[PDB]
């Protein structure tokens, strides 16, 4: 009652801490969930000035992209297929110079919805590369404020006691974005969160729906695409699927949008669908994460039932460590608890 009270049209927020709020990380979430962000699905965190990860971003030109995709778009009518096809190994170096050559850069323009306009019209000629899911952080080994290589959340709980690590969700991944390269609709893995830090060059736009209405987004896209629907019970999380804000507009899917800019930070919240697109050469880092909050989500996740190396991870630990009193209930497969998307997480007390 109180929480649905909070930011009430779910828009996407945008924080600006103090050094003194910055340093805790876990507990600037909760905050932020505290203030509604999460109702959005996405916000923004703009770091205080005085805050860098790394001195210079001179030094990586030699850094290699192992396997840089070609983003092959086929659709139209603001519905569209994204298929990926695996290039040859290149350079930071080398994959700026392809980015910035006329036939790959950022074509000109005055507002952004302009740019926006031209993605939307171009997407599926001349298709770009993306040197995404690089394993590697470029946070200097020293900087303890948002972290993406260690935020010390509970998920650590997962690697702690299995040994497992999954790349890009307990680690973290680089993004060597061009312009018109793009990320499809999706919620993380496991719905997580997730922290994207742009270290530098031009913006990623995005797209987001709030997890309040989640569903209203996966009835349209299986009306939309009935025959991958039919055949995954959550096709979405193959991230091929592309769906233009009009398209949304047109059939009452509420949605916010946001651009990144250099030096900011967007968090994604459990069950948000978001999607987006890379302006010109920049450079992202991101990781996943989670809160007591996710817990729940992560118990509930309807998960991708067509491919091997999907990302599955093991609530048991979570739920006997953080819901003792649920676990045979739910080992027994009568938890029915029901997820209100509009709490904030139980850290958030103290605000
Ligand atoms: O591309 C982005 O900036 C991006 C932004 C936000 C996200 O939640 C993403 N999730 C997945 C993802 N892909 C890239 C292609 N290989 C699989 C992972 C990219 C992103
Ligand atoms: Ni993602
Ligand atoms: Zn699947």
């Given at each position: 009652?109180?929480?649905?009270?909070?930011?009430?049209?779910?828009?996407?927020?945008?924080?600006?801490?103090?050094?003194?709020?910055?340093?805790?990380?876990?507990?600037?979430?909760?905050?932020?969930?505290?203030?509604?962000?999460?109702?959005?699905?996405?916000?923004?965190?703009?770091?205080?000035?005085?805050?860098?990860?790394?001195?210079?971003?001179?030094?990586?030109?030699?850094?290699?992209?192992?396997?840089?995709?070609?983003?092959?778009?086929?659709?139209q009518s603001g519905l569209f297929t994204?298929?990926?096809?695996?290039?040859?190994?290149?350079?930071?170096?080398?994959?700026?110079?392809?980015?910035?050559?006329?036939?790959?850069?950022?074509?000109?323009?005055?507002?952004?919805?302009?740019?926006?306009?031209?993605?939307?019209?171009?997407?599926?000629?001349?298709?770009?590369?993306?040197?995404?899911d690089v394993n590697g952080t470029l946070?200097?080994?020293?900087?303890?404020?948002?972290?993406?290589?260690?935020?010390?959340?509970?998920?650590?709980?997962?690697?702690?006691?299995?040994?497992?690590?999954?790349?890009?969700?307990?680690?973290?991944?680089?993004?060597?974005?061009?312009?018109?390269?793009?990320?499809?609709?999706?919620?993380?893995?496991?719905?997580?969160?997730?922290?994207?830090?742009?270290?530098?060059?031009?913006?990623?736009?995005?797209?987001?729906?709030?997890?309040?209405?989640?569903?209203?987004?996966?009835?349209?896209?299986?009306?939309?695409?009935?025959?991958?629907?039919?055949?995954?019970?959550?096709?979405?999380?193959?991230?091929?699927?592309?769906?233009?804000?009009?398209?949304?507009?047109?059939?009452?899917?509420?949605?916010?949008?946001?651009?990144?800019?250099?030096?900011?930070?967007?968090?994604?919240?459990?069950?948000?669908?978001?999607?987006?697109?890379?302006?010109?050469?920049?450079?992202?880092?991101?990781?996943?994460?989670?809160?007591?909050?996710?817990?729940?989500?992560?118990?509930?996740?309807?998960?991708?039932?067509?491919?091997?190396?999907?990302?599955?991870?093991?609530?048991?630990?979570?739920?006997?460590?953080?819901?003792?009193?649920?676990?045979?209930?739910?080992?027994?497969?009568?938890?029915?608890?029901?997820?209100?998307?509009?709490?904030?997480?139980?850290?958030?007390?103290?605000?």
């Amino acid at each position: 009652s109180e929480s649905e009270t909070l930011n009430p049209s779910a828009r996407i927020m945008t924080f600006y801490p103090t050094m003194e709020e910055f340093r805790n990380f876990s507990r600037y979430i909760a905050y932020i969930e505290s203030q509604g962000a999460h109702r959005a699905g996405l916000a923004k965190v703009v770091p205080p000035k005085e805050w860098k990860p790394r001195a210079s971003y001179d030094d990586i030109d030699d850094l290699v992209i192992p396997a840089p995709i070609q983003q092959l778009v086929t659709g139209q009518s603001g519905l569209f297929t994204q298929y990926n096809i695996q290039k040859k190994a290149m350079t930071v170096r080398e994959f700026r110079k392809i980015a910035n050559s006329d036939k790959y850069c950022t074509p000109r323009y005055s507002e952004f919805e302009e740019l926006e306009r031209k993605y939307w019209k171009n997407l599926t000629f001349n298709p770009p590369i993306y040197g995404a899911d690089v394993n590697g952080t470029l946070y200097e080994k020293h900087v303890d404020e948002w972290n993406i290589g260690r935020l010390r959340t509970i998920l650590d709980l997962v690697e702690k006691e299995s040994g497992i690590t999954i790349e890009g969700v307990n680690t973290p991944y680089l993004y060597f974005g061009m312009w018109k390269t793009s990320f499809a609709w999706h919620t993380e893995d496991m719905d997580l969160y997730s922290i994207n830090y742009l270290h530098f060059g031009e913006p990623k736009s995005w797209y987001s729906v709030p997890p309040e209405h989640g569903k209203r987004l996966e009835r349209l896209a299986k009306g939309f695409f009935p025959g991958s629907a039919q055949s995954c019970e959550a096709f979405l999380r193959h991230k091929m699927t592309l769906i233009s804000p009009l398209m949304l507009k047109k059939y009452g899917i509420p949605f916010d949008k946001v651009t990144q800019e250099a030096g900011e930070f967007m968090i994604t919240f459990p069950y948000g669908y978001h999607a987006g697109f890379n302006h010109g050469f920049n450079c992202a880092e991101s990781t996943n994460f989670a809160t007591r909050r996710w817990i729940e989500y992560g118990k509930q996740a309807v998960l991708c039932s067509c491919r091997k190396d999907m990302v599955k991870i093991s609530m048991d630990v979570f739920v006997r460590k953080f819901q003792p009193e649920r676990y045979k209930l739910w080992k027994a497969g009568k938890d029915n608890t029901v997820i209100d998307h509009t709490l904030p997480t139980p850290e958030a007390a103290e605000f």
